[model samples]
Target: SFSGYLKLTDNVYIKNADIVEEAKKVKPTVVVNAANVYLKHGGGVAGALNKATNNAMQVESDDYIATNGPLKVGGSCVLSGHNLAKHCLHVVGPNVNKGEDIQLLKSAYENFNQHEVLLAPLLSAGIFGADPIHSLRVCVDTVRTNVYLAVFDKNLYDKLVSSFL
Candidate 1:
């Protein structure tokens, strides 16, 4: 078995492992979600987290972005406490299906290095509706700290490993 783990660069990892398992092992400082501007915990990774936290993630959305304003596409909102992680960064990635705003996606992945260990998803590839491979590439290139990509799809994982590793 390949274990679906690839180290693209020092402190940067791309893995198709079970997300919760990996997070428990890595003890990441932050886990970033590719979410909507409104920060709804509706679908994809956001939905998963919502379920994992017993919908506690919605409390953050209700209070934070509701008070701060919507997180613009390519922007991020850091919420305190999600599952076992210390903080959760909700980033609005580009909806390329809507428009080719790669820069916005890049921006969402940028400036996440403040946390020593980070875990992120292949943004915009789910409900936001963007290319998985392109999203993964942008994330890997942008994050400056030790990061792990928690992907569930085998085909998507293969595409990323083949294209990037």
Candidate 2:
């Protein structure tokens, strides 16, 4: 399916597309995974990326934690992109069920300061238990870098277009 696009700001944009493929549109782009402390790139968006490179990311993530320990809330780390993109920015969003924090979520966006073109999925907006629109709003305000929300969820997409910008 062709992706749809929306501009939230001069630098912040959103597209209903595959995040990894979307990033490849540019010469170099980092794909942001809506990650957990363990950096298990498993679910839909993440799984696609994991499967993209034949689970090399998953192996790297497991190695990363084994070496550096698990990530804290708002913590981040980067991993190889394989053939997907330039890199993968892995950030842990505060668990919604554990009382999510805006700063932590915003930090997930901030840890990408070193990145050039970045494509992100909604942090904690999946089974992690965040309201997709609210997650999008927080990231939009703090997106200091060129960022795109690679949203494939139609419910989140409809709510995004219908809600305040």
Candidate 3:
């Protein structure tokens, strides 16, 4: 069976035989890079999905993308561009409010891969919205499963690990 673990241990040890017993596979580490682009919001597919599918956009309504030096949360509005961006997808959900839930984040990663997004930008929507740490964890989770996380603020590195580690 495929399984996952959340650690709160001083140290957790696992035998190779136990891993084989579960027929599980572990993935390598993923490195994230941050970029700052003053991107307008309307660069993605306009149509929204009634249900999550094999073909879905990476970002949904109420997402965020970083700019200049801070994070910008996306809104319901869309920006007009020379080309309609059908390639990039920004995913958003209730997780922005609630504390980090691994399952919902995993779903975001799954849907992101469906749209062929090799990398993603984890942005903060508002001050009280998705914090940098939560965004980073979600990004890291996606990366662990084989996706690249695009973090915008380089200064946020220590801010992220400080909370958990």
Candidate 4:
């Protein structure tokens, strides 16, 4: 299948694969979620990952909220991954309809720095309605970790590669 991407950095790359499967494809990976402050896992990447993980993320999210308090717009929370990956990371992006928060988007992506491998979709591109191009800019700039971004759109991927060059 045409399911891989060219290099974006010294290490990071993109792939046209399901985040859940990519987690299995790259063992010991953390799959990042495009989530809300509440970690609702109600839609988009968050919803699918939560359900695939057997609601384990949802359960941990409840605990995280209870213990850590409200997750800020740019903040992130880590959870144990039982379904496929070794861990899960949730990042909240600013709603574009609300306003663009570049700093928050950058901060959310920066949270991925600690990992060796990951499966991250373009955050905020789903129901949150953040600009994909803008999000991709933040993603490439801040991600120090070696990871695979789950990008399905060929046109977007082309732009990403073209921009990277």
Each prediction's whole-model lDDT (CA): 0.74, 0.76, 0.31, 0.76
Error of 4 at 158 (Å): 4.1
Question: Candidate 3: what lDDT?
Answer: 0.31
Candidate 2 per-residue lDDT over residues 120-165, each given as its tens digit: 8888777778778888888877777777778787777777878956
Error of 4 at 86 (Å): 0.8
Runs with alpha carbons beyond 4 Å of true place in candidate 2: 1-4, 23-27, 98-103
Q: At residue 18, what lDDT does model 4 achieve?
A: 71
lDDT for 52 (candidate 2): 74
Q: What are the TM-scores, per candidate, against the unseen true structure?
A: 0.86, 0.87, 0.35, 0.85
Per-residue lDDT, model 3, residue 137, is 57
Per-residue lDDT tens digits of candidate 3, residues 1-165?
113322312221111122111211322121111111222223221121111212222232223333222222221222211122322343432234545443454444344444322333443322215565665555455433334332334455345434653
Model 4: which residue pairs collide?
A: none
Native-to-model Cα distance after best TM-score fit, residue 122 in candidate 3, in Å: 1.3
Using TM-score, give the best candidate's number.
Answer: 2
lDDT of 2 at 12: 73
User: For model 2, what is the error of residue 50's alpha carbon versus the real structure, in angstroms, after optimal superposition?
Assistant: 0.9
lDDT of 4 by residue, 1-165 (tens): 214556777867876667766666655557788878888888778888888888988898999889888888888888887776777888788767667575678878878887877778887775778768777777888888776788766777677667663
CA displacement after TM-score superposition, residue 64 of candidate 1 (Å)? 1.0
- Flag the better candidate by TM-score, 2 or 3: 2
Judging by TM-score, tell me the better candidate of 1 and 3: 1
